[PDB]
């Protein structure tokens, strides 16, 4: 294929040479007859003298050795100096390639090519499934979804991984291969557009490989942060935050923990009055004692306010936590000013209340906090608070690999510059490439143990049902963490032990065949096996 074009260029050079030697005049001395020695165009040369001509233009690496010259020695006989079998003999050391034609035996080359189609079709089938699932989520009824957003970004890293391998294999088939007797000799040389092209693809591959396990950590962290209770302590811990040191505020007081005022006059030493009473002697069990008492005092206040009591009674436990959130920030008299908004919540008119709450001056001051509280009244669940971590989840999936891969690209460019990076030095790929992946798996197993202990507590409580969406999503995430968390660790532990070779080529195609269908497995169990998407598929299809 690639050699067919070269053979056409060579035939063109041969035709072009035979015409250039035709027009020259016949020799009047006994000189080395002008000839095309299957490599270059040589004019008549006198005996006992070495000739030279510029490296032929048909070669792929023309511009790299165009300044260089090939040589051919003329002998005393009047005949050119020949090789061992009488073939033409020329010194083409200068015009030679920047690489080596690596031979591979008849059956061994047929084995590598046979296993090559298995991983080309494997990644193509996965890419086809990945892009099918991405089209279903990203252009249908789950458009502005919080759960499907994490899946789409997880598939996106696999699409790049599947894309990079298909490009690299497509650029590795641009090498020149020819059969030398039994062996198939493949040249290590690549074109200037292919050397740079596969180098970029190698960066995009390594960026994808790290991102896959980073977004696998996000999938694990999603269940851990979603499924944990969810309590008012986590709700206000996102809105205000935990703190051990006392800091000033808009009224001029000593604010500590999650929204607590210690002393009524501006002072530092007198703030230990109410702190020692709660402690009885600041940590996470000590500081939460101040927080728990605050929430109880907020509920006390809501029930002692005539305007706030009936609204608080009518609303459910999750919606109550949204009102306590407001009273925490504003106060009893401040939240009681929402006479029109509160009325709409007592009537159970959520979307009508969502418009009137945003129109008030509370949303004007702090829009980020109020938007999450308004959503809690709207849907009646903690949907807004699981999305607060999404910005941080985005920085851990795309930002975290760039902390390791972008500095590695610059290291491999100047230190060990190779054609298509897949070296076995164990210096750059272990600390720069494997470390961010091995640390993700380390944190994933620490999450996995926390997921099971959170599952057993929930499976015996009031939210114990098996047909729940949180139970369904766990069946996928608890499978992809141990399957991927073992596949890449078992491969890296035993890969420097074998030479090339006999047991290595069988071991490589064992793991690479699973790695090719890795993207298909992720797509199937998260999108295609998903019941919620299957219901909307039947809804969208049965309409016609």
């Amino acid at each position, epitope marked *: 294929q690639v050699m067919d074009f070269l053979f056409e260029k060579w035939k063109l050079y041969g035709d072009q040479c035979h015409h250039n030697l035709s027009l020259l005049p016949p020799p009047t001395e006994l000189v080395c007859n002008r000839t095309f020695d299957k490599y270059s165009c040589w004019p008549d040369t006198p005996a006992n003298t070495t000739a030279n001509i510029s490296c032929p233009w048909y070669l792929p690496w023309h511009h790299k050795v165009q300044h260089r010259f090939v040589f051919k020695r003329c002998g005393p006989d009047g005949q050119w100096v020949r090789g*061992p*079998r*009488g073939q033409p003999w020329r010194d083409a050391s200068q015009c030679q390639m920047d690489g080596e034609e690596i031979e591979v035996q008849k059956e061994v080359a047929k084995m590598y090519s046979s296993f090559q189609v298995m991983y080309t079709v494997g990644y193509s089938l996965s890419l086809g499934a990945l892009l099918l699932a991405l089209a279903i989520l990203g252009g249908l009824s789950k458009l502005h979804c919080t759960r499907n957003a994490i899946h789409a970004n997880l598939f996106a890293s696999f699409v790049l991984k599947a894309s990079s391998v298909l490009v690299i294999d497509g650029l590795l088939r641009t090498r020149y291969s020819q059969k030398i007797g*039994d062996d198939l000799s493949v040249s290590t040389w690549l074109s200037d557009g292919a050397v740079a092209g596969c180098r970029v693809a190698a960066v995009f591959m390594q960026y994808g490989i790290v991102a896959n396990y980073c977004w696998l950590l996000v999938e694990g962290l999603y269940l851990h942060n979603l499924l944990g209770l969810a309590n008012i302590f986590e709700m206000l811990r996102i809105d205000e935050g935990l703190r051990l040191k006392i800091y000033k505020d808009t009224e001029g007081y000593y604010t500590i923990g999650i929204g607590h005022l210690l002393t009524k006059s501006p002072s530092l030493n007198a703030a230990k009055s109410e702190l020692d009473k709660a402690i009885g002697r600041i940590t996470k069990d000590e500081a939460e004692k101040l927080f728990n008492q605050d929430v109880d005092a907020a509920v006390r206040g809501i029930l002692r306010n005539a305007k706030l009591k009936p609204v608080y009674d009518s609303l459910d436990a999750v919606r109550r936590a949204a009102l306590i959130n407001m009273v925490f920030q504003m106060g009893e008299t401040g939240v009681a000013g929402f006479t029109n908004s509160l009325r709409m919540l007592q009537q159970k008119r959520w979307d009508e209340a969502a418009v009137n709450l945003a129109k008030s001056r509370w949303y004007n001051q702090t829009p980020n906090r109020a938007k999450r509280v308004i959503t809690t009244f709207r849907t009646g669940t903690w949907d807004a608070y699981e999305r607060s971590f999404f910005s941080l989840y985005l920085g851990i999936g795309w930002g975290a690999p760039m902390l390791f891969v972008v500095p590695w690209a610059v290291v491999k460019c100047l230190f060990e510059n190779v054609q298509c990076w897949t070296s076995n030095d164990n210096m750059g790929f272990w600390w720069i490439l494997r470390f961010p992946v091995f640390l993700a798996i380390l944190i994933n197993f620490f999450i996995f143990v926390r997921i099971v202990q959170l599952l057993v507590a929930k499976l015996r409580a009031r939210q114990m049902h098996h047909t729940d969406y949180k139970f369904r999503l766990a069946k996928s995430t608890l499978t992809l963490i141990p399957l991927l968390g073992v596949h890449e660790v078992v491969f890296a532990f035993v890969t420097d032990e074998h030479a090339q070779g006999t047991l290595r080529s069988a071991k490589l195609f064992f793991d690479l065949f699973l790695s090719s269908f890795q993207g298909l497995l992720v797509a199937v169990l998260y999108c295609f096996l998903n019941k919620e998407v299957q219901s909307e598929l039947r809804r969208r299809w049965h309409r016609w």
Partner: antibody
Amino acid sequence: QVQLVESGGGVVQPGRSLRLSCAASGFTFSSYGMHWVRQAPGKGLEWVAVMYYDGSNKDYVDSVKGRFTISRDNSKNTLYLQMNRLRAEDTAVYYCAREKDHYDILTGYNYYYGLDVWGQGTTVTVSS
Amino acid sequence: DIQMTQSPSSLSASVGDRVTITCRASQGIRNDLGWYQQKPGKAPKRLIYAASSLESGVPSRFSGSGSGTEFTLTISSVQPEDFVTYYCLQHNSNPLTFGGGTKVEIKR
């Protein structure tokens, strides 16, 4: 169907000439280099000439140099050997054989793979 | 010119024996060696090429080995048909040179 069938050899007189013929079938004659090999009645095998498609590359054994002349017609798929100034030492059975060669366009080196397919042998008796 | 010293000139072996013919090249000729078999009246047929590689359709008993200067043809278990002449052939440098020719005769 890959074969080579010699012909032409017979009884000749010393000094006179004789043109041996070797007719290829079953393969692309233009690809393969070709050889001539003789064997004396009581002695072992002796190489004598070679040629390639060019056919600027020809070679012979010191004893037959100038005397013997190898040639080919790729259209007729035939190898030849014009044997002039014949001597008693030439009395032999003459085999022809093909050699596959490969030229690496990238490096400019030739790789040779020996005499694979042989003929059956045409006897040449040179006597008065 | 490469003198192909073939040894022995005529070995005596009986059916079943392992026969070992050796050809020694005067210069370094790489793996460029071919072992041939000539039956009485028939043309010479190559059994081994590239010094060690076996020709397609040749009984597995025949085997080649060696490189450069020492080369060996080995018939693990001679059968009735194997009792004929064998030659080595160098194709590394012109002029091409054969061996003297080992004749495998049936011992008694």
